[PDB]
Amino acid sequence: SDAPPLTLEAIKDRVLYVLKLYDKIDPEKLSVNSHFMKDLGLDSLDQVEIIMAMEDEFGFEIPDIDAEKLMCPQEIVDYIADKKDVYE
Amino acid sequence: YLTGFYSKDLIIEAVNMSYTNAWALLMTLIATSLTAAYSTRIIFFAFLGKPRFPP
Amino acid sequence: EHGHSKMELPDYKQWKIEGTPLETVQEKLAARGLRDPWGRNEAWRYSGGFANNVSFVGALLKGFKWGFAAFVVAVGAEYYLESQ
Amino acid sequence: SFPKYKPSRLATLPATLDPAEYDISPETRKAQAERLAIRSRLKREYLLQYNDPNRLGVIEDPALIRWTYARSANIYPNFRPTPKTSLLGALFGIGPLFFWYYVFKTDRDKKEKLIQEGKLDQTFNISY
Amino acid sequence: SGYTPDEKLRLQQLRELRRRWLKDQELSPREPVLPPRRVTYRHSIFAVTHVLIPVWIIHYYLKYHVTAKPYTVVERKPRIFPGDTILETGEVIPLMKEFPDQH
Amino acid sequence: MLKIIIPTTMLLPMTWMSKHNMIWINATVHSLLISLISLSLLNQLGENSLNFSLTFFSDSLSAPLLVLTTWLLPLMLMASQSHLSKETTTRKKLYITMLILLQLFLIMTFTATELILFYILFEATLVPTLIIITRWGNQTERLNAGLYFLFYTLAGSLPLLVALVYIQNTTGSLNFLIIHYWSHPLSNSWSNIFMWLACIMAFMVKMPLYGLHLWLPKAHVEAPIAGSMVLAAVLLKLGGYGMMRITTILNPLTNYMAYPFLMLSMWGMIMTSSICLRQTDLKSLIAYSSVSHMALVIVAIMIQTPWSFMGATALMIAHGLTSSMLFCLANTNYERVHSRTMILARGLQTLLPLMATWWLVASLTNLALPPSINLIGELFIITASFSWSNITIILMGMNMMITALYSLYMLITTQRGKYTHHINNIKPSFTRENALMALHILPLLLLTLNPKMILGPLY
Amino acid sequence: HVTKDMFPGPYPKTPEERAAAAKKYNMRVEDYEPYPDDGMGYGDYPKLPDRSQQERDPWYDWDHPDLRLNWGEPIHWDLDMYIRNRVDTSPTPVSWNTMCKHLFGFVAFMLFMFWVGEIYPSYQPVGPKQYPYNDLYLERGGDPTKEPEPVVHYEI
Amino acid sequence: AFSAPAAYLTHQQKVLRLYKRALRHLESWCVHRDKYRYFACLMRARFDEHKNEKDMVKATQLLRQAEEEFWYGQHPQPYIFPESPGGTSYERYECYKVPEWCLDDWHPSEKAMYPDYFAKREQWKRLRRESWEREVKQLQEETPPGGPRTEALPPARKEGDLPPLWWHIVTRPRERPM
Amino acid sequence: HGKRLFIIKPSGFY
Ligand SMILES: CCCCCCCCCCCCCCCCC[C@@H](O)O[C@H](CO[C@H](O)CCCCCCCCCCCCCCC)COP(=O)(O)OCC[N+](C)(C)C
Ligand SMILES: CCCCCCCCCCCCCCCCC[C@@H](O)O[C@H](CO[C@H](O)CCCCCCCCCCCCCCC)COP(=O)(O)OCC[N+](C)(C)C
Ligand SMILES: CCCCCCCC/C=C\CCCCCCCC(=O)O[C@H](COC(=O)CCCCCCC/C=C/CCCCCCCC)COP(=O)(O)OCCN
């Protein structure tokens, strides 16, 4: 396998990397605690597209009932860490 | 002049010149054509295009 | 001994649609009046060493040149040795 | 227009193509609420019985015991002799026996007749 | 849509407890303790205790026990061609009749 | 033979005067010692028999069954050691007394040079079994099971007594040697047909034949562990042994009187093999498997060819050992689970690996895997039935496929998969259970080296 | 530790009896439908949909994840039939009838064309092979004391 | 898996799920990235043209022919992630997950190794022993009469309190225990 | 790397 033990800061960096390449949102305004519907004015379909992008980038797929209620990068990071059992 | 040649070429040659069923002849020929086709599919889809794996 | 070296992700501003076949997609979407928000996200698949691709026939003859040179050398050596 | 998906016994109708949940009425919503309510009640009971540190055994499941009792020990007391049951019993319990008896009797009669005529070529048939 | 405040708080507390439990799963340097107690060369010994000894045993078994009984080991008779000589008798098989040889 | 019967009798005073905390040790040790003594009987000769005296004789058909009977008792004691922990000393001694009486009756039955003595002990083997089933049984259906087991057997075996006394009145002797030497053909008459039915039905009910097997699932499910093993291993072989002993006087009537029973068995093997697939219980599944195997043995005996008899004896011994092992494993699972349901406990291989190995070996042996004696008997019967008629191969192959299917279903449902979450009393397996499984399985893999010891007199 | 009332009972004609049974099986009164009162001994047991057990929601947090079951819920009469290890009724991309039609057509066409090709075989423009010694009579079966009719071969 | 479900799915949830499934199957059909992006943008365009419809009867009339069209062109062999309920490695490691309570049956000789781990284990067990007594009362006083209506559990409200029914969620074995 | 974990397994001593 030789898979490195991905950590919380690595997950956050990857999440922000994926988000900053989504040109619908400006990289400067976004923050780890920024919202999606209100702080960035993104559509529901747009949020689904972000969720699918993180799905493709991380190699594991999020169930719909849990994907439809993720609205901040911080809670996305927390969900991924809980899925992958990350200590720190 | 490879390992598969010394067997498969003789198989096809012997099959072509025996008092056998004709439908089996046609089926074998189409089968070897499709063998080449799916080998091409494997190579093209797994070694040629742009990368598609996770980052 | 494992893979612990503190890998650093590249800068996000490096990836651009320029020089990739994503221009055709962007242009045909703009002709009908839309844009692809995720265009840059996959630019890395066409940017680095992955930029150059090899055709199927060229892939098949992976070592044709070296093999042909060795074959010519061997044939010439056999010709000049057997003629004795 | 697209060709329609016709469901069968071994390929059921998908939930998305089903029309029951598109004709929504308040009583349907009430029914779904009651279903979720009883399911959550059962789940809460199970979780209360499941996380107890004092419990050191197997959580008895009334549904499993009821299913086993219905499958095994409740068949005869609810059985009644009816034309359908009687016909099915007679067929499935008698027909195969007589079918196989007829087949084997015919085969052995043919073999014995060939033996009597002597035209069987039983050479090397030492072990029997 | 989205998380309710109760859901957020419960998930946060569960995450904290889960991370504590996972961190507690780590093993310290002295955590694994084993009580000790006892009562070319590699290939050289390997070929002796794994190859040579089975050859010896099987050769003995075949030569002096299996071949003792009749017909246990039966060998296909070697092919005889025109021109060869037989060890047991010494006679020479006559050659062919000189078939016409062109090309 | 008395060198075997006398120590078995002395086991009773030995047990009854033992200390309160040492009955199991003494019983196990002396039962094992008795088994060693019984090993001497196995050296049969190609001639008639080992005619010990006017009352007991031993053949190469009786020797394997006798050795298995003497070997089973220590295993029964080790199996019963578990659930009798909270039992008073007197009741434990009574249990051991019942087991010893059962062994003594079986030992006296299997030799029994005279047919009336054979019948007397053959019915005497019914009282200790009924007491064991109806007394030390857990479920409330043990009473109905005991009634079924008693009456199904007795109704079939009562006409046998009349047939035997009639034969003695006409023939003049019931000694098996005289019966074999002075045998005369049975004419085709209604009276002779009913004599055939009376002499056969008593053994066919106990085997059991398909259609009269209703008592077996009840008796096997409701009985304690020791009763289950003694039913599946030895008590089922009484019918087949009696049938192979008594078919010597029913010729040539059998040549056409075997058709109903042959058809019933060759279809009931398929029916019970299919039944095993859809089962919510483990002990019931094993009981139906035993019914299928005994139906195959019935077919073999009714064919009446040397290969049939050899395969029948081999299958008898192999099925006895395999069914005893399977019942042992099911009991070990039930003791921890306390439910006796196949799908309630799952994924036990992750928690108990060695018991998973024992499960795999038992299932493979039940699956009739070569070169085990299970497949030896199976294949001999298959070849004999093929000689009887070329169409039997269809039924036999269908039975083989279904047998493999339900054996691997039993293995997979209980061993593979994800463990059940709400069970946290699966303690590590004791040394007693592992030793029990090892002592069950090792004799099978040892007998596969010397098949001639279990191939019967027609070897 | 289960009372007599909990156990399955005979099919009940009356609504009050029906209501009691539906409550016993932990399901809604109008969601409960017993098997028809035929000779077969189903009695008072709900006729759950024949929907399989592989296609239950795979993301729900079941009490038994492998079987996809919840503790206490009514159990299908044929659960051992549908355990994801056996027959499953998952909807398929192509309709069942068209699947059967296509498969049967392909197999029947293949068999018919194999028979047709057997009727019209394929060979080469050659005569039968010739073997020297009376068609190798001695090497095939033997019988040397019979002096078979000698077959001679035509040089061409 | 984590979140408790609702009694029903709203129209918005159905539309979002259909959108996700359609995009996934379109990606499966269009192997390459540029083609996938082009046709995904086209599908988004054809998906948002009825975004602002007001009446619900016509919206429910839609999303039915949409589902039929999806079922007709669903790529009968879609792409499934390896850990998904259809993937190649769905339950690969489910045979390595040994429950925590098994450690209570270890022999003392086996427990002699790893002493610190077992000390922390006893601490966790004591914590659970007190927390359960608090949680049962908290849940009893918090639930409405007549039984719970949804399977959502409340968080901890006091200071020393812990979330009800936490032991078997916190002590999951691992994602890849071995 | 010092990231050794504890492997929960049943008692293999017996
Ligand atoms: C290197 C050697 C390898 C082979 C070793 C083989 C050892 C075999 C030991 C096992 C023997 C099995 C028991 C056999 C019993 C059947 C025979 C027995 O009934 O014979 C009796 C005789 O039995 C012996 O006297 C006693 C043997 C009993 C003990 C066997 C050895 C092992 C016993 C172990 C017991 C426990 C040991 C201590 C544990 C703490 C009576 O004989 P009898 O009918 O008059 O003979 C008439 C013919 N005569 C006149 C020619 C004699
Ligand atoms: C249910 C679970 C299994 C239980 C056991 C099943 C096995 C019992 C079946 C009995 C075996 C066969 C019985 C009779 C066999 C003789 C052959 C006879 O049946 O065939 C014809 C006989 O014709 C008629 O069958 C006459 C008998 C008819 C009356 C018998 C009852 C038939 C149906 C009853 C079935 C009930 C079985 C279970 C009872 C509880 C041939 O006519 P014929 O050549 O001239 O006479 C031959 C005899 N001779 C030569 C001595 C003169
Ligand atoms: C699990 C339940 C099984 C029940 C088994 C019961 C059926 C057993 C078969 C019949 C038993 C009775 C047979 C009688 C005992 C044999 C004695 C004998 O052979 O003597 C005959 C006598 O034969 C008889 O008397 C038979 C009469 C039968 C009366 C009782 C009938 C019982 C039921 C009959 C049908 C059962 C058959 C199938 C049973 C299948 C199992 C249910 C010779 O008569 P003689 O006087 O010597 O004449 C010579 C001068 N010509």
Ligand SMILES: CCCCCCCCCCCC(=O)SCCNC(=O)CCNC(=O)[C@H](O)C(C)(C)COP(=O)(O)O
């Ligand atoms: C290869 C497979 C091809 C499959 C093709 C599938 C069919 C494609 C065409 C589908 C047709 C439709 O759009 S069916 C149209 C269904 N009806 C409506 O959309 C009315 C109002 N829509 C909403 O309110 C939603 O929430 C929304 C605003 C979209 C998002 O809201 P968010 O703000 O919360 O993101």
